[PDB]
């Protein structure tokens, strides 16, 4: 037991010491993890499709992307695009090979709430000339500065001038020097502007072939989006930068540094995890401890799936089965009970060393700002998303918009999900909704939702889901205000304006000035002191001749009032005099009605009169 | 189901083979031949289970494909070939000849014969017909169709055929006071003498047989086979003389031997 635990800890220590003293040096380095960030529609992706030469870019059902993925380019492609311009080191032995990871950029869900699972060895920042710098670009370079990693900056829309001589697949220096002079001056002016715009943000940037001294300097590489001029210069500078800088960090050692990157629900596969397998020769039919939402899960690997080389984790491709796999690749893993898991955490692979635990409180420190904040105890909206990243994005939107959420799930919508939305319906009718992002609605779920009072918000583009939800909030506010009206009588204290033209009865035309609160139509009124005599439902409030919705805290409003059908209507002089005060009839029902769901239209700093009038009306 | 069945489950095989439950799921499945699937014996069973020569199924085809085994003086390499009642299995390698006779308890017994007796076989005639310019024909229980039979041979008579040729040497009429053997029902394998038959028109004829030990039993006509003329058999009998002795003296005999 404890002696097995003690020797288990000591043999773990032996293994990691062996895996530290192993340490293979002298070339054969690890493939760097090249990250790519942007604003919204800069060109952070589709440049990757141009690198890998993939025809399908526009097949996203929208201009924006909503997931992480690694394209996995391997040396033949590097050599193929290298031989085109042929700079340095023909058939270089020293190159591991390239691994590019694509990141989705957007204002909402704050650039994938990133937290870009760090591991951004070489970060590529699209600047995109046409629009200059962007707020997500400044917050991205702030994030890149927060954890000090080396990153470079690439331009995208250099050909978009109308006058660029589009000579594709050639040197940037050549293509720039083969244009007219005025355009070069315009490019060097906006280059200077970008250099100053980085210089002010605690950087030192320059144009990729001057000095260069990339120790302190950063490389402004001009690239064309559509044509592909600079793609050679890009991959050259990437391999050069990685060869020069990352000489020791990228050693092919034998530690266990597999990281959980994405979680996906695929048909006939269960719940699959995309992992960037960096260090650790993990085997098919070997136990792994995946860090979960509701504690860690012991998972048995059924097998290793990899997409074809120069292809993304975008569209369901012919994923080839691999029994085992070396530590330089990004692979998809599937097993048993991978339901609730956390993204951007390291993955421990375990042999038969009798259960090696307790590495979670040492990970879960100040990264608790995730799905774990679930209020099953309380009420809330139901949320579903294609991948986990999207689910986090929806929850942090709900957090920002101030709405509680009860249940969350990954994959398509089912009859249990609409039943959880139904069991909510009893508590708060508004909250009984399902926010479904880029997932297949089922017929049985949809027909069960339509048969009950449960609405589902289906949308592939996240803008539609946000807009649809907010529209529903305003629609429910309108649906609440109208058809549940005049019960919130609203606080009203009227002072009589003496020597005004009175209409006696049927109707009563009364010239008044409000002293406490504001006065609108349909508020019942009462006179105290003379017992408690009542005038039910004021019909219209008018200034001089014109109609008004509210009183302006001391207005000369002539109000038309028709007392409710009783045995006798009340008369001026006989029952109530000009000296007597006019006070609104506020009860437990009315105060409770105007307490909740009247906090936006409700008065600003006059509240106290309610507490001051409920005490005299006895509440 | 569609078309004919090709398999046979082990427990669904006929009981007189004495296949055990655990050895497999399937059985031998006797192939089409002269004798019925229910009332035949695959060579795989005879070699492997009865003679104890082969251990596995491969050794049986390794024996048979080397062409050491004849049935009625004709070489058969089919390991699931049906050899039934009165069929003479000949192993000319080891010079051993067996005739398939049912024993008292109602199963094919490993009954050896002299090589001189492995020359002929007895056969019960099923029908008699004539056709195409009137050469009369005969058909027997082991499906041997013979042309120009002796006109004294009527239906339910027995004929003795030389195995090297296909011609009738001698024949026995089915009359009162003739040695017969039962080949179907409760009384299967019992040898006795005919006393009488009771003809039931439009139904099965029932015969009464008296045993050598004063035991009298009845049987259907179809399950009778004349083996001897008068009381003397024309073939050798099994270890027991076809005498159904009861469980009482079965125990007495077994305890006496001990």
């Amino acid at each position: 037991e404890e002696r097995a635990y003690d020797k288990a800890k000591r043999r773990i220590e032996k293994r990691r010491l062996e895996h530290s003293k192993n340490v293979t040096e002298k070339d054969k380095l690890r493939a760097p993890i090249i990250c790519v960030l942007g604003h919204v529609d800069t060109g952070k992706t589709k440049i990757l499709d141009k690198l890998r030469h993939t025809h399908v870019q526009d097949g996203e059902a929208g201009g924006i992307t909503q997931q992480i993925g690694a394209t996995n380019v391997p040396l033949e492609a590097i050599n193929e695009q290298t031989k085109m311009i042929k700079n340095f080191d023909r058939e270089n032995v020293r190159i591991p090979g390239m691994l590019i990871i694509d990141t989705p950029g957007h204002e909402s869900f704050s650039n994938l709430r990133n937290r870009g699972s760090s591991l951004c060895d070489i970060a590529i920042l699209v600047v995109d000339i046409m629009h200059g710098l962007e707020p997500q670009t400044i917050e991205s370079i702030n994030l890149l500065k927060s954890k000090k990693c080396p990153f470079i900056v690439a331009l995208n829309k250099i050909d978009r001038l109308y006058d660029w001589k589009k000579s594709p697949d050639s040197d940037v220096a050549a293509t720039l020097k083969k244009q007219k002079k005025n355009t070069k001056d315009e490019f060097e002016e906006r280059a200077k502007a970008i250099i100053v715009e980085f210089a002010q943000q605690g950087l030192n940037a320059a144009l990729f072939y001057e000095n260069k001294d990339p120790r302190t300097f950063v490389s402004l590489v001009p690239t064309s989006a559509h044509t592909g001029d600079g793609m050679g210069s890009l991959i050259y500078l990437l391999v050069e930068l990685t060869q020069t800088m990352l000489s020791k960090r990228l050693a092919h050692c034998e530690e266990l540094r597999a990281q959980v990157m994405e979680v996906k629900a695929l048909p006939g596969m269960g719940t699959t995890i995309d992992v960037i397998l960096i260090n650790g020769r993990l085997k098919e039919g070997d136990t792994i401890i995946v860090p979960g939402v509701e504690g860690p899960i012991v998972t048995q690997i059924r097998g290793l799936l990899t997409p074809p080389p120069m292809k993304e984790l975008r569209v369901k491709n012919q994923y080839e089965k691999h029994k085992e796999v070396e530590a330089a690749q990004g692979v998809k893993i599937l097993g048993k009970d991978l339901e609730k898991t956390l993204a951007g955490l390291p993955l421990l692979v375990a042999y038969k060393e009798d259960e090696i635990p307790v590495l979670k409180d040492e990970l879960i420190h100040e990264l608790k700002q995730t799905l774990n904040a679930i209020k099953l105890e309380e009420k809330g909206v139901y949320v579903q998303a294609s991948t986990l990243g999207s689910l986090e994005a929806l929850l942090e939107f709900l957090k920002t918009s101030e709405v509680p959420y009860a249940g969350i799930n990954i994959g398509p919508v089912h009859k249990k999900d609409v039943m959880k939305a139904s069991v909510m319906l009893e508590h708060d009718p508004q909250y009984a909704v399902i926010l479904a992002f880029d997932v297949r609605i089922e017929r049985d779920a949809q027909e069960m939702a339509d048969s009950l009072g449960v609405r589902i918000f289906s949308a592939e583009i996240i803008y539609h889901l946000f807009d649809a939800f907010t529209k529903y909030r305003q629609d429910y506010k309108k649906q609440k205000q109208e058809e549940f009206k005049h019960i919130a009588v609203f606080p009203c204290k009227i002072k009589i304006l003496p020597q005004y033209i009175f209409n006696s009865r049927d109707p009563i035309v009364m010239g008044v000035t409000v002293e406490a609160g504001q006065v609108k139509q349909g508020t019942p009124m009462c006179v105290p002191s003379k017992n408690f005599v009542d005038i039910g439902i004021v019909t219209s409030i008018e200034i001089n001749h014109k109609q008004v919705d509210v009183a302006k805290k001391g207005q000369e409003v002539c109000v038309k009032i028709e007392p409710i059908p009783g045995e006798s209507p009340k008369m001026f002089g006989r029952h109530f005099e000009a000296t007597d005060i006019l006070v609104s009839k506020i009860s437990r029902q009315s105060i409770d009605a105007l307490k909740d769901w009247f906090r936006d239209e409700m008065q600003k700093s006059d509240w106290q009169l309610i507490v001051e009038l409920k005490k005299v009306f006895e509440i | 189901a569609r078309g004919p069945k090709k398999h046979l489950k082990r427990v669904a095989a006929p009981k007189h083979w004495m296949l055990d439950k655990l050895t497999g799921v399937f059985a031998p499945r006797p192939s089409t031949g002269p004798h019925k699937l229910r009332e035949c014996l695959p060579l795989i069973i005879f070699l492997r289970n009865r003679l104890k020569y082969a251990l596995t199924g491969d050794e049986v085809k390794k024996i048979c494909m080397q062409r050491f085994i004849k049935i009625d003086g004709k070489v058969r390499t089919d390991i699931t070939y049906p050899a039934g009642f009165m069929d003479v299995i000949s192993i000319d390698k080891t010079g051993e000849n067996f005739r398939l006779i049912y024993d008292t308890k109602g199963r094919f017994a490993v009954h050896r014969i002299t090589p001189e007796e492995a020359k002929y076989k007895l056969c019960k005639v099923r029908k008699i017909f004539v056709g195409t310019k009137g050469i009369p024909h005969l058909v027997t229980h082991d499906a041997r169709t013979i042309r120009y039979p002796d006109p004294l041979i009527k239906v339910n008579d027995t004929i003795q055929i030389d195995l090297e040729t296909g011609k009738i040497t001698d024949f026995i009429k089915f009359d009162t006071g003739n040695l017969c053997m039962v080949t179907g029902g409760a009384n299967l394998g019992r040898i006795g003498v005919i006393t009488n038959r009771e003809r039931h028109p439009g139904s099965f004829d029932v015969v009464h047989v008296k045993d050598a030990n004063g035991n009298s039993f009845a049987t259907r006509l179809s399950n009778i086979f004349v083996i001897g003329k008068g009381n003397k058999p024309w073939i050798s009998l099994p270890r027991g003389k076809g005498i159904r002795l009861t469980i009482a003296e079965e125990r007495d005999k077994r305890l006496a031997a001990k």
Binding site: - | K9, R10, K21, V25, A248
Partner: protein, 180 residues
């Protein structure tokens, strides 16, 4: 379809009334006298006796000249003479009904090992058998519920390998001999 048999049988019947003084006593006497592990072992012998008695009872109803009754009766009596709960004198079917649980519990290897004076207590015998010290004929048995045959009684000897009989010191004696 699979080439496996599913022929499994329950060997004990639980009592109708779970808590009943007079009964619990009677079972605990049997355990105490013959050092049995649990009340399952008493119910086992009750169930086997009951089945033998039911077989005798359903044989009695048939006529005295019936071949089936004669054969079955003789076979049952032969087996009960063979196991050693009767003798040649009292070998009538009627006397099968006059047996009891004591007669069957006497024939346990545990009981015989105690009664022949190999073990010096009813509890020691069960351990000695279970520890692979005892052997019948040339066969080393470690089954307390081994029901000994009448003719197999006259040789229960210590298994030759055994320290007690065979002449080879065990772990304790070896360890004490090395540290001696």
């Amino acid at each position: 379809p699979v080439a496996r048999s599913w022929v499994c049988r329950k060997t004990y019947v639980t009592p109708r009334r779970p808590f009943e003084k007079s009964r619990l006593d009677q079972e605990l006497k049997l355990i105490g006298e013959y050092g049995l592990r649990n009340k399952r072992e008493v119910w086992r012998v009750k169930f086997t006796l009951a089945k033998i008695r039911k077989a005798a009872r359903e044989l009695l109803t048939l006529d005295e000249k019936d071949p089936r009754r004669l054969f079955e009766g003789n076979a049952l009596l032969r087996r009960l003479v063979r196991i050693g709960v009767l003798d040649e004198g009292k070998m009538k079917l009627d006397y099968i009904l006059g047996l009891k649980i004591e007669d069957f519990l006497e024939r346990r290897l545990q009981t015989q090992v105690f009664k022949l004076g190999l073990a010096k207590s009813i509890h020691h015998a069960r351990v000695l058998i279970r520890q692979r010290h005892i052997r019948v004929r040339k066969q080393v048995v470690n089954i307390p519920s081994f029901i000994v045959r009448l003719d197999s009684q006259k040789h229960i000897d210590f298994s030759l390998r055994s320290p007690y009989g065979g002449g080879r010191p065990g772990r304790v004696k070896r360890k004490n001999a090395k540290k001696g």
